[PDB]
Amino acid sequence: HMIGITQAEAVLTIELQRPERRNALNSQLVEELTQAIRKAGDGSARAIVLTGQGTAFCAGADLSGDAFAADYPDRLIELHKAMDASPMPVVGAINGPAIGAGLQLAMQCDLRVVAPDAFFQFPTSKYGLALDNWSIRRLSSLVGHGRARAMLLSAEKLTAEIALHTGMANRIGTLADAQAWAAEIARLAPLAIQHAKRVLNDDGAIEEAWPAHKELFDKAWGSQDVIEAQVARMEKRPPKFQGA
Amino acid sequence: HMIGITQAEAVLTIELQRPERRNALNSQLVEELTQAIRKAGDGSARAIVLTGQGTAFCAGADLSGDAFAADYPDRLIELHKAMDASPMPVVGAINGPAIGAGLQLAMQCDLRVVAPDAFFQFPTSKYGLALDNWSIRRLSSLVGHGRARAMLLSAEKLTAEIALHTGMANRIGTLADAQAWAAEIARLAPLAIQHAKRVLNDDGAIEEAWPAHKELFDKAWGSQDVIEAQVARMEKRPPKFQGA
Amino acid sequence: HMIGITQAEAVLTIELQRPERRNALNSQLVEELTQAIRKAGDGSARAIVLTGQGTAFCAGADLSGDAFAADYPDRLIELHKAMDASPMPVVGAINGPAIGAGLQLAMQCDLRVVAPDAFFQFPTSKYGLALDNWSIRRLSSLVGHGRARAMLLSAEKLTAEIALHTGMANRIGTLADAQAWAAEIARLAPLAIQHAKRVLNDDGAIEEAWPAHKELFDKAWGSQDVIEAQVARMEKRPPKFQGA
Numbered sequence: 001h002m003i004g005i006t007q008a009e010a011v012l013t014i015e016l017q018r019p020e021r022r023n024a025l026n027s028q029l030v031e032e033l034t035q036a037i038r039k040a041g042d043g044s045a046r047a048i049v050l051t052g053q054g055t056a057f058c059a060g061a062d063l064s065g066d067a068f069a070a071d072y073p074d075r076l077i078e079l080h081k082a083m084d085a086s087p088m089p090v091v092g093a094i095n096g097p098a099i100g101a102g103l104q105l106a107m108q109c110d111l112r113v114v115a116p117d118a119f120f121q122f123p124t125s126k127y128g129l130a131l132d133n134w135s136i137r138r139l140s141s142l143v144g145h146g147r148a149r150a151m152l153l154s155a156e157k158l159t160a161e162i163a164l165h166t167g168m169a170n171r172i173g174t175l176a177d178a179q180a181w182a183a184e185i186a187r188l189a190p191l192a193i194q195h196a197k198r199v200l201n202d203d204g205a206i207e208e209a210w211p212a213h214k215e216l217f218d219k220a221w222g223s224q225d226v227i228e229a230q231v232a233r234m235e236k237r238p239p240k241f242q243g244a
Numbered sequence: 245h246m247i248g249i250t251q252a253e254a255v256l257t258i259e260l261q262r263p264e265r266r267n268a269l270n271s272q273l274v275e276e277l278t279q280a281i282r283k284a285g286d287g288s289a290r291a292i293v294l295t296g297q298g299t300a301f302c303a304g305a306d307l308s309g310d311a312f313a314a315d316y317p318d319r320l321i322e323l324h325k326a327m328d329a330s331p332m333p334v335v336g337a338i339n340g341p342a343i344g345a346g347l348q349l350a351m352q353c354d355l356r357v358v359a360p361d362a363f364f365q366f367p368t369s370k371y372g373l374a375l376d377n378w379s380i381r382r383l384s385s386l387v388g389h390g391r392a393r394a395m396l397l398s399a400e401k402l403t404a405e406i407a408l409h410t411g412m413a414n415r416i417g418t419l420a421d422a423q424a425w426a427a428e429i430a431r432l433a434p435l436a437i438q439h440a441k442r443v444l445n446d447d448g449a450i451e452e453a454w455p456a457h458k459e460l461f462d463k464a465w466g467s468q469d470v471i472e473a474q475v476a477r478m479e480k481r482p483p484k485f486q487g488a
Numbered sequence: 489h490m491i492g493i494t495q496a497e498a499v500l501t502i503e504l505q506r507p508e509r510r511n512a513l514n515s516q517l518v519e520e521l522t523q524a525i526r527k528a529g530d531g532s533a534r535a536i537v538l539t540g541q542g543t544a545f546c547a548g549a550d551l552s553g554d555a556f557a558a559d560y561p562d563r564l565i566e567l568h569k570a571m572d573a574s575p576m577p578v579v580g581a582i583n584g585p586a587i588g589a590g591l592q593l594a595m596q597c598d599l600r601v602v603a604p605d606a607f608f609q610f611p612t613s614k615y616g617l618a619l620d621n622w623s624i625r626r627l628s629s630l631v632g633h634g635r636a637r638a639m640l641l642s643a644e645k646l647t648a649e650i651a652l653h654t655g656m657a658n659r660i661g662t663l664a665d666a667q668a669w670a671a672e673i674a675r676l677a678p679l680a681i682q683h684a685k686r687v688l689n690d691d692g693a694i695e696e697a698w699p700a701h702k703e704l705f706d707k708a709w710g711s712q713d714v715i716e717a718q719v720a721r722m723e724k725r726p727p728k729f730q731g732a
C-alpha cells in the first residue's frame with residue numbers, strides 16, 4: 001500500500017509512495033521495500049530502479065502513528081541486507097532530497113542518477129544522534145573523506161552538482177534517464193555484475209563498530225541533548241545543547 | 245622483438261611494440277616487459293617511462309597464435325610483481341586507449357601522464373568475466389568508489405578529462421611530456437621514492453579474494469555466457485545472456 | 489610565548505606565533521600547542537580554530553637554536569594524539585603554505601578553510617626523508633590516491649584550488665571565514681560531533697608501519713643522501729643523490 005512496483009521489459013521499478021511525508025520511512029514501508037527487493041528476480045528482471053514519488057527521494061524517518069515502531073531499526077537493517085545480497089544491480093533514481101535514512105538508502109543502491117534539485121544530508125549533528133559505521137565509511141568512499149568530515153561534523157548538504165563532482169552521483173538526470181540506463185545494464189552479463197557488486201560492497205565499509213564507537217554511540221543516543229533537539233524543533237526555537 | 249628499450253640520461257623508456265593489435269598482451273610481450281623492468285637498474289636509470297607504439301597504450305589481451313597461452317595468466321602476475329617490487333618509479337605515458345589488461349598495466353604504473361584522446365575501460369560486464377580484487381581496489385582508489393561502480397557494473401569508459409578530474413591521470417600530455425617529468429623525478433632522492441612507493445602500494449589494494457569472491461569469480465569464468473559473448477562478437481550481433 | 493590564545497563566545501582560536509620562521513615547529517611551539525589543545529575545554533568553548541601568524545600556516549620544522557631538539561619527534565607525536573583525542577572539532581584556518589610538519593598539522597585538523605594563496609606540500613623526495621604511515625594514508629584520503637602518489641613521489645605542490653577540488657579544503661576563505669563557520673559548529677550537538685570524529689579518525693589511517701616500511705624508513709633517514717641534500721641546500725646547488 002506504500003510502494004508501487006512496475007516493470008518494462010527487464011527493468012523493475014520500485015517507487016516509494018508516501019509523498020505526504022516526503023517518503024520518510026516507517027516499518028510498513030521498510031517491510032514492503034524488503035519484500036519487493038527479494039522478489040525482484042520474479043523475474044525476468046535484470047535490473048531494478050529505486051525511486052520516490054513526488055518531490056523527495058526519502059527525507060528520513062517518520063514513525064509517527066506507526067504501530068511497529070520498536071521493530072523499525074531491525075527491519076531497516078534487514079532491508080539493507082536484502083539490497084546488499086541482491087544479485088540485481090539497483091539504480092537509484094534520486095528524484096529529490098535524500099536525508100538521513102534516505103541518504104543511507106540512496107548509498108545502498110548500486111548506482112545513482114540524481115535529479116538537478118536533489119541534495120543529500122546527514123543532519124545528525126543537529127539532532128544529537130550518531131550513525132552506524134557503514135554509513136560513515138560508505139559516505140567517505142562516495143564523497144571523499146574531506147567532504148565526509150564536513151557532512152558529518154557540520155551537517156553540510158551535498159548538492160547534485162557536487163555529488164556528480166565526487167561520484168556520489170554517477171549521472172545527473174531524471175527517473176526516465178535512470179530507467180534507460182538500467183535497460184542497458186539489463187543487457188550485460190549477470191554473473192559479471194554479481195561478482196563486481198559483491199567485491200565492491202566488500203571494500204570494508206561493512207564494519208562492526210569498535211568498542212569506543214559503541215560507547216560514544218550509546219552516550220549520544222541516550223543523551224538529554226537528543227530530547228532538547230526534539231522539543232526545540234517543536235517549539236520553533238534554536239536548541240541549547242549541553243553535551244550531555 | 246615486441247618491445248623497444250631506449251634511454252636518455254637517467255630515464256629508461258620501455259615501449260610496447262605490437263601496434264598491429266593495439267599492443268594487446270601475449271606471453272612473449274609479457275615476458276619481455278618483465279625482463280626489461282627487472283633489468284632497468286642497469287642503470288644508471290633512476291626512472292622508467294612505460295608507453296605504447298601507435299594509437300593505443302594497450303587494448304587488452306590477444307593470445308591468438310601465441311604458443312604459451314596457458315602460461316599467460318601466471319606470467320602476467322609475475323609482471324605485476326616485478327613492477328610492484330621495482331625500486332624505480334614507473335611513469336606511464338598512456339598514449340591511447342587502455343582497456344582490460346591494459347588498464348591493469350596502466351594502474352600498476354606509479355604515475356600517469358595521459359594523452360588527450362586516451363580512455364580507460366574494464367569491459368568485463370560485456371564479456372561475462374570477473375576481475376581480481378586488486379584491479380577493483382586500485383581502480384576505486386584512483387577514480388573514486390562511485391565511478392568505479394559505474395566502470396565495473398556497466399562498462400563505463402573513463403575519458404582523459406575525467407581521469408585528470410579524479411587523479412587517475414596525474415597530467416594530460418604526451419610521451420615527451422612524460423619523459424620530461426620523469427627526468428625531474430630522476431633527480432630526486434631514490435630512497436625516499438622507494439619508501440613512499442612501498443607504503444602506497446601497501447594501502448590494502450593487494451588483497452586476497454574472499455571465499456565468496458572466488459566462488460563468484462569461478463562461476464563467471466566457467467559460464468556459458470562467456471562463450472555466448474565470444475560467438476556474438478564474431479557473428480556481429482548482440483549477445484543473449486542467461487546468467488549461467 | 490610562541491602561541492596566542494583568544495576566545496570569542498564559544499570559539500577558541502589558537503595562533504602559531506613564529507612568523508620570523510614561517511611558523512616552523514620546534515619543541516617549545518609543539519609543547520605550547522599541546523597544552524592549549526588539552527585545556528581548550530576550559531571552556532565554555534565548543535570549537536577550536538587553529539591558524540598561523542603572517543604569511544604561512546606552518547612551513548615545516550626549524551629546530552635551530554632549540555635546546556630540546558632531541559625531544560621534538562616524541563613531543564610532536566603527543567601533539568597529534570592530543571588533537572585526535574580532543575572532543576572539540578578543530579577547524580584549521582590554513583592562511584598560507586603548509587609544508588612538511590605543517591601539512592601533517594593541517595591534516596590533523598578536523599576541517600579546513602584554506603586561503604587562496606596557500607599551498608600544501610611534502611618535499612620529502614627532495615630531502616631524502618621518509619614519512620610515517622598515517623601521513624601517507626590521511627593524505628591519500630584527502631587528495632585521492634592518484635594525487636597522493638604525485639605529492640609523495642615527486643614533491644608536487646597542492647594549490648588551494650585543487651585542495652578545494654579534492655576535499656582537502658572544505659572551503660576557500662580567510663581566518664574570519666573559519667571563525668564564523670566554527671561559531672555555527674559550536675551550536676551543534678557535542679556528542680554527535682565527538683562520535684563522528686572518533687569514527688572518522690578510526691578509518692585505518694592510524695596505521696603501524698609494516699616491517700618492510702620500517703626498514704625502508706630507517707634506510708632513508710640514515711642515508712648519506714639526507715646529508716647531501718642538506719649541504720647542497722646550504723651551498724646553493726642541486727644535490728647529487730646516490731641512493732645510499
Ligand SMILES: CCc1ccc([C@H]2C[C@@H](C(F)(F)F)n3ncc(C(=O)NCc4ccc(OC)cc4)c3N2)cc1
Nearest residue numbers: 073074076077080081084101104105132133134135206
Ligand atoms: C550487509 C549489508 C549492510 C550494510 C549496512 C548496514 C547498516 C544499515 C544501517 C541502517 F539500517 F540505518 F540503514 N545500520 N544502522 C545500524 C546498523 C548496525 O549494523 N548496527 C549494529 C548492530 C547490528 C545488529 C544488532 O542487533 C541484531 C544491533 C546493532 C546498520 N547497518 C546493514 C547491512
Ligand SMILES: CCc1ccc([C@H]2C[C@@H](C(F)(F)F)n3ncc(C(=O)NCc4ccc(OC)cc4)c3N2)cc1
Nearest residue numbers: 317318320321324325328345348349376377378379450
Ligand atoms: C604484488 C603486486 C601485484 C599486484 C596486483 C596483482 C594482480 C594482477 C592481476 C593481473 F595479472 F591480471 F594483472 N591479477 N590477475 C589475477 C590475480 C591474482 O592475484 N589472482 C589470485 C591468484 C594468485 C595466485 C594463483 O596461483 C599462483 C592463482 C590465483 C592478479 N593479481 C599481482 C601482483
Ligand SMILES: CCc1ccc([C@H]2C[C@@H](C(F)(F)F)n3ncc(C(=O)NCc4ccc(OC)cc4)c3N2)cc1
Nearest residue numbers: 561562564565568569572589592593620621622623694
Ligand atoms: C593517534 C593520533 C595520531 C595520528 C598520527 C600520528 C603520527 C604523527 C606524525 C608526526 F608526528 F610527524 F606528525 N608521526 N611521525 C612519526 C609517527 C609514528 O607513529 N612513528 C612510529 C613510532 C611510534 C612510537 C615511537 O616511540 C614511542 C617510535 C615510532 C607519527 N604518527 C600520531 C598520532
